[PDB]
Symmetry: C3
Subunit: 117 residues, 3 copies
């Protein structure tokens, strides 16, 4: 797919997602929420959406990823919503790996009001 | 698919999930976990499951979604498990958008005890 | 698929994921992150990855699952990264159900540097 920016990395065939980098240094105190920018935009292929999910290295540090749904039509820059849910302060270096992007299939249903049994 | 209730909204073709609304007003103090009700039930199509995932607007407020797996056979009402992982108190208005439902494909494997190399 | 270990349970046709058990007793104080071991390894089918996601029973207790992406090529033992984001202490008994594994499809794209409109 078409992407702009260098905040996203090519992956191998055997990996599920693309590593996303932090565009600038970020400090987070316990309980702080900050939207970390990546500087990348992309054109998800028709019929698919992107899921931002955490990496074990940052997660093991007590950092979590919130939200995480990239809609196919989105063209803005991708941002990773991170929170320090640990009890110690953390600094994420610039261009550090903070999350992963996984491309998944779309399923559109019509909503039918009825009675589910 | 068949649904009952008005706590879920039709989406566009370009969106990955359906917005879920809160059935009643909810207050959450830092560190509090509450199962927010939506009032909706649904009949997921055979071969698929539903994933409840967070929205960037509430997530940016320090709210996270836990659990999140709707099994195809479930017919009960859908509930969103939310926690205030931020350091400030939050109130979710009635019928406010709190999460998103995404329909994904099922893959059933048989478990073979063996030796993975 | 081929698995080794008894920390993972067969599921029904109607369930989305396989329950994962804790290999040993674990205590977690508010705000503590610990990688809970399961003792299971597996050979994900080619073309798929595994997603570790939370269960409503533990999630309703204020426990969250971080990270969660099993790459198809991984052969090591599966570990569940858990954090107590609640305000009370928790003990997870040995062989207790702590998470769920869901198998999802892989989508590999080539990264094309361009200009997204
Ligand atoms: O963690 C996230 C979640 C969302 N978006 C973007 C891309 C989506 O298309 C858009 C959607 O908004 P919500 O539906 O999450 O509010 O926001 C991000 O950059 N990061
Ligand atoms: O956040 C959640 C998670 C689960 N369920 C429901 C629908 C599922 O079929 C059922 C499954 O239970 P667990 O397997 O998550 O314990 O609970 C919810 O309403 N909300
Ligand atoms: O919650 C998790 C996340 C990852 N892994 C394993 C399997 C993956 O193939 C590997 C990948 O590492 P990261 O890409 O998450 O850093 O770690 C786990 O056991 N548990
Ligand atoms: Mg999550
Ligand atoms: Mg979380």
């Amino acid at each position: 797919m078409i992407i702009e920016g260098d905040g996203i990395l090519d992956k191998r065939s055997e990996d599920a997602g693309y590593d996303l980098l932090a565009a600038k240094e970020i400090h987070l105190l316990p309980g702080e929420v900050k939207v970390i920018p990546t500087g990348v935009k992309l054109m998800l292929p028709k019929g698919y959406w992107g899921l931002i999910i955490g990496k074990s290295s940052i997660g093991s540090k007590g950092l979590d990823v919130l939200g995480g749904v990239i809609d196919e039509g989105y063209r803005g820059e991708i941002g990773v919503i991170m929170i320090n849910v640990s009890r110690k302060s953390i600094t994420l270096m610039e261009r550090q790996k903070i999350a992963q992007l996984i491309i998944l299939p779309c399923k559109h249903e019509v909503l039918e009001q009825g009675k589910v049994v």
